[PDB]
């Protein structure tokens, strides 16, 4: 049905990435990050040239002061681990609060528009130098915000 443009698709409605990481083998020596976990958000009734004209896409969340542009993590490693969000271009850090860069990466599939995002965990430069990251769970939240013009 054609109404309410670029709304999030029912399928890409419940997104979440699960990082498979080990303290000593991933956060103690460079690069000091986990492999990129990929999650895709598909916008329905949305088209190429119209994106930036109809809606802005932003990831909001608590920033990790030690890693500007990264999300804070909760639990024992709070302040040691940061979550990096990769924009659709597969390289640019999509800092929290900043909008997604129109263009590169987006895939125009059908009447919809898929947004292949990436996320990875990374240690604070100090948390890495000191090898302070401990085995143990961490959690992080992010809000994908659709702002309509």
């Amino acid at each position: 049905l054609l109404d309410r443009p670029c709304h999030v698709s029912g399928d890409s409605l419940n997104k979440h990435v699960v990082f498979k990481t080990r303290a000593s083998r991933d956060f103690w020596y460079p690069p000091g990050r986990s492999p990129t976990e990929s999650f895709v958000i598909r916008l329905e009734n949305c088209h190429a040239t119209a994106v930036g004209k109809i809606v802005t896409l932003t990831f909001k969340g608590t920033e990790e002061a030690a890693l500007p542009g990264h999300l804070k993590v909760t639990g024992v490693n709070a302040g040691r681990l940061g979550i990096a969000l990769l924009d659709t271009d597969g390289s640019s850090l999509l800092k929290p609060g900043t909008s997604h860069n129109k263009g590169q990466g987006e895939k125009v599939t059908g009447n919809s528009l898929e947004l292949p995002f990436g996320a990875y965990v990374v240690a604070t430069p100090e948390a890495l130098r000191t090898k302070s990251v401990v085995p143990g769970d961490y959690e992080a939240t992010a809000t994908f915000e659709l702002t309509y013009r």
Partner: protein, 215 residues
């Protein structure tokens, strides 16, 4: 997802309240639907002058309900001859994940909420955007919005097609305002905007020298 049937909402100041329809569009997880209002600067305001309730509610998969928009007495402090800008936000929080090391993504929809004083109530048929004035200036056009309303411009071109396609960073004009947008010169300017209903009409301008007006 918690569906916001339209892209904006106008609050008729003549009314004491109005309802906004929402709904969980996922068929699995029940959602916690947070609804709140931000001011023109997008800062959350829970005190007023515009209120949204309930602040949170549970929405089962595919269920629908509402959020009530109402005003406090201090709404009277807002100008009565022009619109005041607010934002309605709907964020849907899913159940926490039991898994470990997870990035929880919540969806949020932010739409403009125009507070329209009773004095500037518009006829359902009225089209005030045809009062917009385009002035040719070095580098583009000076768009002036002499109306009492906010006007969102999403396209400037020389034909109805160029206005709908042509690269253009949408821009919003406050009531009795003006600003310049970079643009190519077009013999007969065509401007596209978004109206109360989400319709994206295009306007035809006729230029008498460097001053263009809607024909």
């Amino acid at each position: 997802a918690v569906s916001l049937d339209r892209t904006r909402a106008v609050f008729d100041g003549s009314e004491k309240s109005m309802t906004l329809d929402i709904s969980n569009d996922n068929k699995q997880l029940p959602y916690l639907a947070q609804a709140w209002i931000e001011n023109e600067n997008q800062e959350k305001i829970i005190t007023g002058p515009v209120i949204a309730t309930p602040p949170v509610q549970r929405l089962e998969p595919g269920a629908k309900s509402m959020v009530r928009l109402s005003t406090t007495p201090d709404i009277s402090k807002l100008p009565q001859d022009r619109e005041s800008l607010f934002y309605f936000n709907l964020r849907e929080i899913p159940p926490r994940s039991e898994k470990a090391n997870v990035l929880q993504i919540a969806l949020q929809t932010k739409i403009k909420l125009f507070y329209r004083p009773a004095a500037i109530k518009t006829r359902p048929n009225e089209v005030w955007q045809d009062q917009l004035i385009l002035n040719k200036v070095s580098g583009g056009y000076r768009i002036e919005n002499p109306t009492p309303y906010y006007v969102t411009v999403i396209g400037l071109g020389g034909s109805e097609k160029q206005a709908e396609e042509g690269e253009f960073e949408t821009v919003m004009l406050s009531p009795r305002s003006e600003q310049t947008v970079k643009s190519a010169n077009y013999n007969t300017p065509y401007l596209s905007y978004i109206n109360d209903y989400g319709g994206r009409p295009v306007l035809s301008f006729i230029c008498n020298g460097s001053r263009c007006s809607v024909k």
